[PDB]
Amino acid sequence: HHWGYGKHNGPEHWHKDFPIAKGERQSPVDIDTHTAKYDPSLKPLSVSYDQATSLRILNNGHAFNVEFDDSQDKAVLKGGPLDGTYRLIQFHFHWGSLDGQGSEHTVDKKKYAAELHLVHWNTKYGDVGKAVQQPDGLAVLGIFLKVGSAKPGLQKVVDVLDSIKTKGKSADFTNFDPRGLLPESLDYWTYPGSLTTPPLLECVTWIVLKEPISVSSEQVLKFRKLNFNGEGEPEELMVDNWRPAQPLKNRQIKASFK
Numbered sequence: 001h002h003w004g005y006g007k008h009n010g011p012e013h014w015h016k017d018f019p020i021a022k023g024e025r026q027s028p029v030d031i032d033t034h035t036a037k038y039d040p041s042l043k044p045l046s047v048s049y050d051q052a053t054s055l056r057i058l059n060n061g062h063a064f065n066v067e068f069d070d071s072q073d074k075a076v077l078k079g080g081p082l083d084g085t086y087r088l089i090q091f092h093f094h095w096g097s098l099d100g101q102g103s104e105h106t107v108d109k110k111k112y113a114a115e116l117h118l119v120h121w122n123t124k125y126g127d128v129g130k131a132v133q134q135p136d137g138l139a140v141l142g143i144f145l146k147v148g149s150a151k152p153g154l155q156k157v158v159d160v161l162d163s164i165k166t167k168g169k170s171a172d173f174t175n176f177d178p179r180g181l182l183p184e185s186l187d188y189w190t191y192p193g194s195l196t197t198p199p200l201l202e203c204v205t206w207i208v209l210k211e212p213i214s215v216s217s218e219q220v221l222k223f224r225k226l227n228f229n230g231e232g233e234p235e236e237l238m239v240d241n242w243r244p245a246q247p248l249k250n251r252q253i254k255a256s257f258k
């Protein structure tokens, strides 16, 4: 049936319905800090989220997305390895059943507790639908989460999870400021890749931040209480919604710092 993260429909099965799963620029990948190339020509990232308008939060099976109004250049990402303006359309997380796993990308084989993905699309393409059909259509800002101190800016998200426990549920989520989820430093690694969930389109420029943000054990626990299933169906906890690292193949990971 539909794809998932279970034994019978997990990542190892996606290739049957989405041949691109065994493509040349699939994500996530393991970032080997010792072979990543420091690139002096990489420009600093420009994150302008001051005018961000969040609208809704929803459980879509797989994960929970916080959507933003992308009708105008309100929250945009520019700079770095990007050409043009990219609008923030939504952000979501991937997490594990235990603190030692959850992130999609790994650094020197180290998995973090979770990973935040802030998804943006290239404005030159007019709409996200056209953007996903281009090699530079999307830019996803990836941030690692490690268990430690609580992240104040994340609490508003944690408190609302109860109202969207099952698949298909959504709740109004206005006035959320995504700037509250950023680490202090904007140093990053970048490589061309793909969406990490079906349809696995190879249209993403990945920008993974070096500095993880810290979240408390209690905050991460609440992600784990969400459900993959819809209301009235057998309860399957939403945990381990991450795809294992894919072969790097003929790609080079560039670093904005030495």
Ligand SMILES: NS(=O)(=O)c1ccc(C(=O)NCc2ccc(F)cc2F)cc1
Residues within 6 Å of the ligand: 055, 065, 066, 067, 068, 069, 070, 071, 089, 090, 128, 129, 132
């Ligand atoms: N402007 S808004 O807040 O209402 C909005 C928010 C989220 C999404 C979404 O997650 N769709 C994903 C999505 C839909 C179609 C497609 F081809 C690729 C793709 F990533 C769409 C619109």
Ligand SMILES: NS(=O)(=O)c1ccc(C(=O)NCc2ccc(F)cc2F)cc1
Residues within 6 Å of the ligand: 094, 117, 119, 132, 140, 194, 195, 196, 197, 198, 199, 201
């Ligand atoms: N974990 S991750 O950052 O890589 C990621 C980011 C966005 C999406 C998404 O928008 N899915 C909907 C969607 C629906 C239809 C389509 F054609 C493409 C598409 F991405 C999926 C995975």
Ligand SMILES: [Hg+2]
Residues within 6 Å of the ligand: 131, 132, 133, 134, 135, 136, 137, 201, 202, 203
């Ligand atoms: Hg593409």
